[PDB]
Design a protein around this ligand. Sequence first.
Ligand code: HEM
Ligand SMILES: CC(C)(C)OC(=O)N[C@H](CS[C@H](Cc1ccccc1)C(=O)NCc1cccnc1)Cc1ccccc1
Length: 451
Amino acid sequence: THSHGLFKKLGIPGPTPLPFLGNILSYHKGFCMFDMECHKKYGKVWGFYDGQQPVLAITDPDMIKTVLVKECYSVFTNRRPFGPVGFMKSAISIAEDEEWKRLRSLLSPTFTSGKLKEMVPIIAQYGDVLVRNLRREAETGKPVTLKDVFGAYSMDVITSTSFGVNIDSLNNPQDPFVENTKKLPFFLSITVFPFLIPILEVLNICVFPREVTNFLRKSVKRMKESRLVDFLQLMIDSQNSHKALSDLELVAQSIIFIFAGYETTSSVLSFIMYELATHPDVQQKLQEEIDAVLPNKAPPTYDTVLQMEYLDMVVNETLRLFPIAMRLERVCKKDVEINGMFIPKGVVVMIPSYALHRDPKYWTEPEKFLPERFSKKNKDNIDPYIYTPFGSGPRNCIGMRFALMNMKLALIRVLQNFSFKPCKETQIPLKLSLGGLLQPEKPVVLKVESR
Ligand code: HEM
Ligand SMILES: CC(C)(C)OC(=O)N[C@H](CS[C@H](Cc1ccccc1)C(=O)NCc1cccnc1)Cc1ccccc1
């Protein structure tokens, strides 16, 4: 301190920071709105300060590719640290440098296409649970809260695809597992006071409610020593050139996968159903495609899901509008130059995906939900370093193909059986949480009718 002269020195523009707070008061309307304003106010690069922490936003695609792919191992290896994390330091998305590289290797084969194909039957079964739970509300002409019913399904897939546990968490009961996973303003104080992280790490306050972590640490070792197709097994089989996965490390990845696949899968489904309800022609076109590929509500398979091109377009265009990461970030670990621009050590480089996905300079009518932008005709004109809903380079979303498959199997089975209509209580137009997550302000409620 005061680092608040850094961008002024390098001649990079940006909004003037306030002492101690940097630019964070500018987050009051949300990260996303701030990034769009900076994009329009300042052009291709700009800097700002989370507290004392310099953040350099970059929007040039070549420069993005340099940061995410070309210089990843050498410079831009880690994300911005947050805490306190406790033992979750060993989790893949949080770990750093060689320890992350290791964990990436031990977990990468778990997410192959081949392994994903063997997970489809198990992921198929809970699609049926999803329909029946939906019908009980469709037969009772009462509006439905999608996040609840989609969460129940996403919850259902996680416990099965990661541990073998099998529940209908929606109704079926207070089964011992649904509840510790229920615990599925503090994080802002971190940024003005990031020097308090090591404080909280010697105090063992875990952002992961220390009890849940205590529940699964023992829960895993119950499962481990009971067996001795799912993620736990795929990881246990792995610990049988890198030191094998420890027993606590395995747990920490389990936790990351539960987090990853719960509110992401559920929220993206809710975003998709909102678009399909408020664009009835897309919904019908999708329903026809599904009936053409799977006549008589034939059960979807891995191969038939990959066959559905309009399904893919609907999914991709939704992710354009609602990229739930909002931003991609890498810590600069060395003095470097990329594409004719100096970057000093310790700067956080940030790619503002939300802003890039809704930038008129690449997207016509960016606010409109228009699946055709992803027609095999048009999909080729889309810069992969502008549309980046799963990141890019060695540190992109490891769960990407699982998550696309998991969501699509849900949609297919659901669209075979129901149509989705707006209720008077639907928020139209949907608004984003002014807060820190990409979620709707009010939850998505829609009318559900049986075909
Ligand atoms: C639609 C759902 C999802 C989306 C849009 C999504 C998106 C992302 C994005 C944008 C990143 C950052 C990548 C980067 O910085 O370049 C990421 C990281 C990650 N995601 Fe996902 N994700 C989703 C679901 C999942 C699921 C289901 C898993 C299951 C395990 C998962 C596991 C991970 C992991 C482990 C990382 C950290 C990768 C690493 O640091 O090596 N994600 N995800
Ligand atoms: C800005 C603040 C500090 C408020 O919260 C974050 O920093 N939020 C996370 C960073 S840990 C994240 C999820 C998580 C893990 C433990 C406890 C809560 C949450 C994780 O790794 N989840 C797997 C995942 C999540 C979403 C998409 N795909 C994969 C979000 C994150 C986004 C992209 C890459 C890595 C992390």
